[PDB]
Design an enzyme around this catalytic site. Structure first.
Site, PDB file in Angstrom:
ATOM      1  N   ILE A   6       0.715  -1.235  -0.246  1.00  0.00           N
ATOM      2  CA  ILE A   6      -0.116   0.228  -0.246  1.00  0.00           C
ATOM      3  C   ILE A   6       0.576   1.046  -0.308  1.00  0.00           C
ATOM      4  CG2 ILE A   6      -1.476   1.540   1.699  1.00  0.00           C
ATOM      5  CD1 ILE A   6      -3.318  -1.273   2.145  1.00  0.00           C
ATOM      6  N   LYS A  14      13.504   2.626  -4.750  1.00  0.00           N
ATOM      7  CA  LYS A  14      12.417   2.329  -5.285  1.00  0.00           C
ATOM      8  C   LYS A  14      12.197   4.377  -5.147  1.00  0.00           C
ATOM      9  CE  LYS A  14       8.724  -0.494  -3.669  1.00  0.00           C
ATOM     10  NZ  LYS A  14       9.711  -1.993  -4.179  1.00  0.00           N
ATOM     11  N   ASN A  47       1.480   4.595   8.168  1.00  0.00           N
ATOM     12  CA  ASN A  47       0.849   3.060   6.618  1.00  0.00           C
ATOM     13  C   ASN A  47       2.085   2.416   7.628  1.00  0.00           C
ATOM     14  OD1 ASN A  47       0.227   2.159   4.572  1.00  0.00           O
ATOM     15  ND2 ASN A  47       2.351   1.752   3.696  1.00  0.00           N
ATOM     16  N   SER A  79      -7.890   0.043   9.127  1.00  0.00           N
ATOM     17  CA  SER A  79      -8.563  -1.515   8.353  1.00  0.00           C
ATOM     18  C   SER A  79      -9.825  -1.049   9.245  1.00  0.00           C
ATOM     19  CB  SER A  79      -7.740  -2.217   9.287  1.00  0.00           C
ATOM     20  OG  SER A  79      -7.971  -3.585   8.730  1.00  0.00           O
ATOM     21  N   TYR A  92      -4.386  -7.187  16.882  1.00  0.00           N
ATOM     22  CA  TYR A  92      -4.603  -6.379  15.093  1.00  0.00           C
ATOM     23  C   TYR A  92      -5.745  -5.455  15.574  1.00  0.00           C
ATOM     24  CZ  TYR A  92      -4.111  -5.763  10.522  1.00  0.00           C
ATOM     25  OH  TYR A  92      -4.270  -3.970   9.764  1.00  0.00           O
ATOM     26  N   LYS A 100      -5.954  -1.654  15.986  1.00  0.00           N
ATOM     27  CA  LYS A 100      -6.311  -1.184  14.531  1.00  0.00           C
ATOM     28  C   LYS A 100      -7.647   0.323  15.060  1.00  0.00           C
ATOM     29  CE  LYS A 100      -3.862  -2.009  11.137  1.00  0.00           C
ATOM     30  NZ  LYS A 100      -2.452  -0.853  10.208  1.00  0.00           N
ATOM     31  N   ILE A 160      -7.009  -5.594   0.511  1.00  0.00           N
ATOM     32  CA  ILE A 160      -5.960  -5.606  -0.181  1.00  0.00           C
ATOM     33  C   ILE A 160      -4.539  -6.647  -0.847  1.00  0.00           C
ATOM     34  CG2 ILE A 160      -4.877  -3.850  -1.509  1.00  0.00           C
ATOM     35  CD1 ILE A 160      -7.310  -3.056  -0.630  1.00  0.00           C
ATOM     36  N   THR A 169      -2.490  -8.048  -1.165  1.00  0.00           N
ATOM     37  CA  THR A 169      -0.645  -7.546  -0.770  1.00  0.00           C
ATOM     38  C   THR A 169      -0.101  -8.829  -0.253  1.00  0.00           C
ATOM     39  OG1 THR A 169      -1.145  -6.578   1.850  1.00  0.00           O
ATOM     40  CG2 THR A 169      -1.229  -4.923  -0.273  1.00  0.00           C
TER      41      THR A 169
HETATM   42  N1  LIG Z   1      -3.634  -5.679   2.786  1.00  0.00           N
HETATM   43  C1  LIG Z   1      -4.726  -5.153   3.561  1.00  0.00           C
HETATM   44  O1  LIG Z   1      -5.519  -6.004   3.075  1.00  0.00           O
HETATM   45  C2  LIG Z   1      -4.716  -3.783   4.911  1.00  0.00           C
HETATM   46  C3  LIG Z   1      -3.734  -3.433   5.017  1.00  0.00           C
HETATM   47  N2  LIG Z   1      -4.370  -2.810   5.794  1.00  0.00           N
HETATM   48  C4  LIG Z   1      -2.795  -2.152   6.813  1.00  0.00           C
HETATM   49  O2  LIG Z   1      -1.970  -1.375   5.624  1.00  0.00           O
HETATM   50  C5  LIG Z   1      -0.750  -1.268   6.272  1.00  0.00           C
HETATM   51  C6  LIG Z   1       0.072  -1.369   4.753  1.00  0.00           C
HETATM   52  O3  LIG Z   1       0.531  -2.965   5.063  1.00  0.00           O
HETATM   53  P1  LIG Z   1       0.877  -3.725   3.449  1.00  0.00           P
HETATM   54  O4  LIG Z   1       1.310  -2.822   2.317  1.00  0.00           O
HETATM   55  O5  LIG Z   1      -0.782  -4.360   2.843  1.00  0.00           O
HETATM   56  O6  LIG Z   1       1.427  -4.961   3.840  1.00  0.00           O
HETATM   57  P2  LIG Z   1       2.958  -5.218   3.499  1.00  0.00           P
HETATM   58  O7  LIG Z   1       3.853  -6.359   4.482  1.00  0.00           O
HETATM   59  O8  LIG Z   1       3.150  -5.294   1.961  1.00  0.00           O
HETATM   60  O9  LIG Z   1       3.784  -3.625   4.034  1.00  0.00           O
HETATM   61  C7  LIG Z   1       4.254  -3.809   5.028  1.00  0.00           C
HETATM   62  C8  LIG Z   1       5.357  -2.369   5.696  1.00  0.00           C
HETATM   63  O10 LIG Z   1       5.489  -1.697   7.209  1.00  0.00           O
HETATM   64  C9  LIG Z   1       6.661  -1.894   6.966  1.00  0.00           C
HETATM   65  N3  LIG Z   1       7.171  -2.820   8.259  1.00  0.00           N
HETATM   66  C10 LIG Z   1       6.768  -3.907   9.340  1.00  0.00           C
HETATM   67  N4  LIG Z   1       7.343  -3.557  10.180  1.00  0.00           N
HETATM   68  C11 LIG Z   1       8.328  -2.294  10.816  1.00  0.00           C
HETATM   69  C12 LIG Z   1       8.731  -1.909  12.001  1.00  0.00           C
HETATM   70  N5  LIG Z   1       8.897  -2.545  12.823  1.00  0.00           N
HETATM   71  N6  LIG Z   1       9.340  -0.368  11.213  1.00  0.00           N
HETATM   72  C13 LIG Z   1       9.266   0.143  10.435  1.00  0.00           C
HETATM   73  N7  LIG Z   1       8.653  -0.496   9.590  1.00  0.00           N
HETATM   74  C14 LIG Z   1       7.721  -1.741   9.717  1.00  0.00           C
HETATM   75  C15 LIG Z   1       7.570  -2.466   5.647  1.00  0.00           C
HETATM   76  O11 LIG Z   1       8.297  -2.191   5.524  1.00  0.00           O
HETATM   77  P3  LIG Z   1       9.718  -3.340   5.176  1.00  0.00           P
HETATM   78  O12 LIG Z   1       9.132  -4.515   4.213  1.00  0.00           O
HETATM   79  O13 LIG Z   1      10.772  -2.551   4.442  1.00  0.00           O
HETATM   80  O14 LIG Z   1      10.343  -3.959   6.560  1.00  0.00           O
HETATM   81  C16 LIG Z   1       6.964  -2.999   4.876  1.00  0.00           C
HETATM   82  O15 LIG Z   1       7.064  -1.517   4.103  1.00  0.00           O
HETATM   83  C17 LIG Z   1      -0.654  -1.872   7.213  1.00  0.00           C
HETATM   84  O16 LIG Z   1      -1.077  -1.023   7.961  1.00  0.00           O
HETATM   85  C18 LIG Z   1      -1.715  -2.807   7.646  1.00  0.00           C
HETATM   86  O17 LIG Z   1      -2.062  -3.229   9.080  1.00  0.00           O
HETATM   87  C19 LIG Z   1      -4.893  -2.607   6.252  1.00  0.00           C
HETATM   88  C20 LIG Z   1      -5.939  -2.742   5.563  1.00  0.00           C
HETATM   89  C21 LIG Z   1      -5.966  -3.787   4.879  1.00  0.00           C
END
Ligand SMILES: NC(=O)C1=CN([C@@H]2O[C@H](COP(=O)(O)OP(=O)(O)OC[C@H]3O[C@@H](n4cnc5c(N)ncnc54)[C@H](OP(=O)(O)O)[C@@H]3O)[C@@H](O)[C@H]2O)C=CC1
Ligand SMILES: NC(=O)C1=CN([C@@H]2O[C@H](COP(=O)(O)OP(=O)(O)OC[C@H]3O[C@@H](n4cnc5c(N)ncnc54)[C@H](OP(=O)(O)O)[C@@H]3O)[C@@H](O)[C@H]2O)C=CC1
Ligand SMILES: NC(=O)C1=CN([C@@H]2O[C@H](COP(=O)(O)OP(=O)(O)OC[C@H]3O[C@@H](n4cnc5c(N)ncnc54)[C@H](OP(=O)(O)O)[C@@H]3O)[C@@H](O)[C@H]2O)C=CC1
Ligand SMILES: NC(=O)C1=CN([C@@H]2O[C@H](COP(=O)(O)OP(=O)(O)OC[C@H]3O[C@@H](n4cnc5c(N)ncnc54)[C@H](OP(=O)(O)O)[C@@H]3O)[C@@H](O)[C@H]2O)C=CC1
Lengths: 280, 280, 280, 280
Positions: C47, C74, C119, C173, C188, C192, C220, C222
C-alpha cells in the site's frame, strides 16, 4: 438568562445541572415496575407478548395491542396469573387517528402510562427492490415500521410531558445497523435505521420529562422469519458468533432494564441483543 | 452451483471472485469524468449547483434539476464555460411518476447516465415535534428527503443494471449520525439516517452493476440554514473542531472521488465532510 | 475572554469563526500536490509504495520509509520518472528515538513536511489469543501497529504546528470497526480500533494547524495476507458485497483526496475502502 | 466436516446451531447471582465498589481488587451486610505476572469465577499531547487502561473455557466512541476505543464458552474527575441531553444485566450509560 447555566441541548431542562433521581440503594429494587403502567404494541405477536408478560411479572399494569389476532385472552391471562390490571386494544398502527384514540383511551382506563414499547412491525419478503415496481410494498413498510412508530411516539410524548416522567422503548433491529444477507430487504433496513435515530433524536427533545431508547434484536425465533428457508437460516447461524437464533425470553431482561429505574441515566442508547451478529 | 464459489451477499455476482477493472496508471486521470453523463438533483440549490459545476469541470455532461427556481441559465452556463452538454429539468421529487419520467427523458436526451447524485432536500424548521400536530410537516420531510431519494434510486438502478455500470451518491447529512442542537429537528434527522442506510442496503443489492455511497456534509454555508440566528450559528462553531462552517468548494472533491474511477472498490461507505463535528 | 466566541473544542483556534481557506475554483486543481512534501511510512510495502508513487504523480516530493527491505531504488524510480525529489530512510518504527531522528532529518532534507502517512504495520497470524501465552506477540502488535503510529504522530504534529499547516493520514483497517473471520486476530483488531480513534482525538487537538484522518482498507491484494489459505480467502470473497479483494491502485484516490486541498473541511473522518465488507 | 453446518466465526462452536440455555420463567430471577462468584477489578474505587456491592446484593460472592487504597474493610462490609463470601486482593494491574497470580488465587479461594469485571483504570490529566514529551504518560495509560485489561482477559478466558461458562464485562467509556472536550486526552480515548473493540473481538473467540461485553459510562460523579474545574463540568452538563452527571447507582443495573442470565443472547455489545452524551 443571567446567572443560569443554559443547556446547549434543550433549554426546557431549566438551569443546569438537573437533579438526579432518588433511587433505592438496592439494585434488585430498581427493576420493579410495581405501581407503574406499561403499554406494549404488537403484543399479540412473539416479542411483544414476551415483553408484556415480563412487565406484569415485574408488577406493572399492562395494555396489550393487537390488529389481526385478538389478544383479550392474553390480557386476561395476565390478570389471573399475576393480579395486575390488563386490557387488550385493537388498532391498525398505520392509522394515526386510531393510534391517538387508543392511547387516549388507555390513559383514561389505566390513569396514566409510565412505560411505552413501540414494537409492532412487519417484514419485507419480496427480495431485491429493483424488481418490485409497485410502490405499495415500500409504502407498507414505511407506514407500519416508521410512521406507525412515530404516531405512537408523538402521542405518548404528550402524556409523558404532562406527568413529567416516562420511558419509551422502540423495537428496532440489527437491520438498522447492518444489511441483512442473503435475504435482500432494503426497505425494512431503511425503516429500522430511521427508528434507531428517531429514538436518539427524541431522547434530546424529551429529556426534561422522559427517556427514549431502542432494543435492537438479532435473529429471534418468532413467526416473522417463517419466510426463510432452512439454507437461509443456516447462513444466519454461520455468521452469528453464538451460533444460533435467540429466544424471546432472552430479550425480556433488556426490555425490563430500559423500562425500569435500573436505567435512569440511560437515554438515546441502542441496546443490541443479537448473539454478536453485528460484530464480525 | 457445484464447483462455484457462491456469494453470501448477492448470488447475481456470479461465481467468485469477481474481477477488478483496468485503471489509469496516473492517479489524476482516475478523477476524470470525460465521456460520462452525470445527473444531479437539487442543482438549482447550493450544494447541487457546486457539484454540477465540478462534474462539468471534470468533463461530464450534466443534467440539472430544479423545482421552484428555474435553472436553464445554469445549464447554459455549463455549456458555454466548459463545452459540455447540459440541460435543466423541472420535477417535484415527491411525485414518483414525475421522477420516473424525468430520469427516462434524461437517458434519452443524453444517451445514458453514468453518475447519479440524489441531493435535493428540505429542512425541518418547526422546532420540537411535540408541539407540531397533524402530520403534514412529518409527511413533507419523509416525502422529499426519503421517498424522493428512493424514487430516484429505484429508477436509476434499472439503467445501471441495463448498462452494467454506474455510481449513485446520496447526499445525507451529519444529521444521519448525530442529533443536531440547539435546533431540534427529529424528523429531518430520521430521514437522513434512513438515507444513509438505504445507500448501504442498495450497495449490496446493486453490487453486480453499480456502486452506492453517501456524502454526509456538516454545516455548509448555503441558504438551507438561513433560518439560523447569529447565536445559533455561534454554538455550531463552538462545537465544530475546525471552528467554522464549510464552503461548497470543500465538498466537491468528495463528490468527484465517489463519482469517478478513483473509488472503484468503494461502496456502501459514508464520506463525512463536517470539520470534525461528529467526533466530540 | 470578553467579546470573543471561544471554542468548546480547542481554545487555541482563537476567536470564532476561523477563516476558511482560499481554494481554486476548479475541482481538479484541488488534488494537486505541486509544491508539497509527503512522507509515507511502510513505503517499501504494497500500500505504501502505491501511495508514494501516486503522490509523486500529483507533484509531491516524497520521503520513503523501509525497515527490512531497502527501497533506495524506489526513491530513485520516483526521481527519474516524475522529476520530484525523493529519498529513502531506514527506521524501526518501534523505536521512538529512531522515529524522531528520521522525521527531523526529513525536515532538514526536504525543508518541511506537508503530508504524512503513518502506514507501516504487521499482522497477527497466530490464531486465537487464548492459546498464546507468551506476551511477546501481543507486545509486537501493540508496539508496531499502535505505539509506532503514535511516535510518528507526536513528532509530525510539532512540525505541522510550527508551520501552521499539515495533513496526517493513518492507515487503519476494517479491523478497527469489525471482527475479522475466520482468522482470529483480536490483538490486531484492538490496535487498529485504537488507531482510528487516535486519529479522531488528534483531529480536535491539532485543529488550529492540521487535519487528521484515517483510510480503512478492506482486503487488499498484498503480501500481508499471504498467511491465508485459499478456503479462507474464499470466505472473505463470499462476505464482500463486491465479491473480491481490492487492488492497491483502488486506494490511491482516497489517499490523494485526504492529502490534498480536495478535503480542507475533512478531519476526524474514517474513509472506508472495503468493497462493502463492513455493511452486511 | 461433512453433514455438519460449520461456523464461519469459530468452528470450536461445533456443528450448528448451538442450543439455548434453560431460563427462569420469572424475569426477576434472571438477574440473580445466587450461587455465582464475581471478581471486580478497581473495586476500591467509585464505580468498582458500587458494582461489587450490587453484585453482593444480587447474591454473589465477590473478590475485591485494590492497588494503593487497601480495601479489606470493604470486603468485610459485604460479608457482614449481605452474608456472602468476600476477600480483597492487592495487585498492580500493569504487572502481568501479578494479574495471573491474583486471578489464580481467587479461583482457588472461591472455587471458580463466573463473572469478571475489568474495571480498574486511570485518567490522562496532562492536556494536549503535543506538549507532553518522552512517552512515560502515554505508556502509563496504555499499560493500565489497555494492557492491564488484556492481562485480565487472557487469564479469565482460560477459567471460562475450562468451566464452559462465564461473563466478562470491560468498563470502557464514552471516550471510546467520542472525543472529550474541552479537556484534551487523546491517549485515554485511544485506550478506551481499544478496550471496546477488544471486547467485541473476544466475543467471537470465546463464544463456545463465554459472553463478552462492555459498559461505557458517561460522566459519573466519582473522584476520577476531581481534576475538573467548575467551568469544565458546566460545559459537560450543557452538552449532556439529561443535563447532569450520573450516579454510580445508575450504572449497577447495567452491570447486573450483563453479568446475569438476563443477557444470555447478549455478546459483543456496548451498553452506553451516558445521559445521552454520545447522541448530539
Ligand atoms: N493489505 C490489506 O489487506 C490491508 C492492510 N492494512 C494496513 O496497511 C498497511 C500496509 O500494509 P501492506 O502494504 O498491506 O502490507 P506490507 O507487508 O506489504 O507492507 C508492510 C510495511 O510495513 C513496514 N514495516 C513493518 N514492520 C515495520 C517496523 N517495525 N518498522 C518500520 N516499518 C515496518 C514494512 O517495511 P519492510 O518491508 O521494509 O520491513 C512494509 O513497508 C498496514 O498498516 C496494514 O495493517 C489495512 C487493511 C487491509
Ligand atoms: N423476530 C426477529 O427476529 C426480530 C424482530 N424484530 C422486530 O420485532 C418486532 C416484533 O416482531 P415479532 O414479534 O418478531 O414478529 P410477530 O409477527 O410475531 O409480531 C408482529 C406484531 O406486530 C403487529 N402488527 C403488524 N402489523 C400491524 C399493524 N398494521 N397495526 C398494528 N399492529 C400490527 C402484529 O399484530 P397482529 O398479529 O395482531 O396483527 C403482531 O402483534 C417488529 O418490530 C420486528 O420488526 C426486530 C429484529 C429481529
Ligand atoms: N449545511 C447544509 O447546507 C447541508 C445540507 N445538506 C443536504 O444537502 C442537500 C442540498 O441542500 P442545500 O443545497 O444546502 O439547500 P438548498 O436549499 O440550497 O438546495 C435545495 C435544493 O433542493 C431542491 N428541492 C427542494 N424541494 C424539492 C422538491 N420537492 N422536488 C425537487 N427538488 C426539490 C431545490 O430546488 P428549488 O430551489 O428549484 O425548489 C434546491 O435545488 C439537501 O439534501 C440537504 O439536506 C446536508 C448537510 C448540510
Ligand atoms: N466518569 C467516570 O468516573 C468514568 C469512569 N470510567 C472508567 O470507570 C473505571 C472506574 O473509574 P472510577 O471508579 O471512576 O475512578 P476511581 O479512581 O474512583 O477508581 C479507580 C480504580 O482503579 C484502580 N487502579 C488504578 N490504577 C491501578 C493499577 N495500576 N493497578 C490496579 N488497580 C488500579 C484504583 O485502585 P486504588 O485506588 O486502590 O489504587 C481504583 O480502584 C475506570 O476504568 C474509568 O476509566 C469511564 C467512564 C466515566
Amino acid at each position: 438568562s443571567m446567572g443560569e447555566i443554559e443547556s446547549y441541548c434543550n433549554k426546557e431542562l431549566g438551569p443546569l445541572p438537573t437533579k438526579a433521581p432518588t433511587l433505592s440503594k438496592n439494585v434488585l429494587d430498581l427493576f420493579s415496575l410495581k405501581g407503574k403502567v406499561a403499554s406494549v404494541t404488537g403484543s399479540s405477536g412473539g416479542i411483544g407478548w414476551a415483553v408484556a408478560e415480563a412487565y406484569a411479572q415485574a408488577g406493572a399494569d399492562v395494555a396489550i395491542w393487537y390488529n389481526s389476532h385478538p389478544a383479550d385472552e392474553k390480557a386476561e391471562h395476565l390478570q389471573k396469573t399475576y393480579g395486575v390490571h390488563s386490557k387488550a386494544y385493537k388498532c391498525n398502527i398505520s392509522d394515526p387517528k386510531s393510534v391517538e384514540e387508543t392511547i387516549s383511551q388507555q390513559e383514561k382506563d389505566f390513569g396514566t402510562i409510565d412505560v411505552f414499547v413501540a414494537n409492532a412491525g412487519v417484514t419485507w419478503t419480496q427480495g431485491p427492490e429493483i424488481d418490485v415496481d409497485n410502490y405499495d410494498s415500500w409504502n407498507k413498510i414505511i407506514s407500519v415500521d416508521l410512521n406507525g412508530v412515530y404516531y405512537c411516539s408523538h402521542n405518548i410524548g404528550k402524556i409523558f410531558k404532562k406527568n413529567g416522567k416516562g420511558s419509551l422503548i422502540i423495537t428496532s433491529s440489527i437491520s438498522g445497523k447492518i444489511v441483512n444477507i442473503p435475504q435482500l430487504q432494503a426497505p425494512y433496513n431503511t425503516a429500522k435505521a430511521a427508528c434507531t435515530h428517531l429514538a436518539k433524536s427524541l431522547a434530546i427533545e424529551w429529556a426534561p420529562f422522559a427517556r427514549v431508547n431502542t432494543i435492537s434484536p438479532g435473529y429471534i425465533d418468532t413467526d416473522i422469519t417463517d419466510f426463510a428457508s432452512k439454507d437461509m437460516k443456516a447462513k444466519w447461524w454461520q455468521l452469528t458468533p453464538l451460533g444460533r437464533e435467540g429466544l424471546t425470553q432472552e430479550l425480556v431482561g433488556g426490555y425490563l432494564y430500559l423500562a425500569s429505574n435500573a436505567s435512569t441515566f440511560t437515554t438515546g442508547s441502542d441496546v443490541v441483543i443479537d448473539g454478536g451478529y453485528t460484530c464480525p
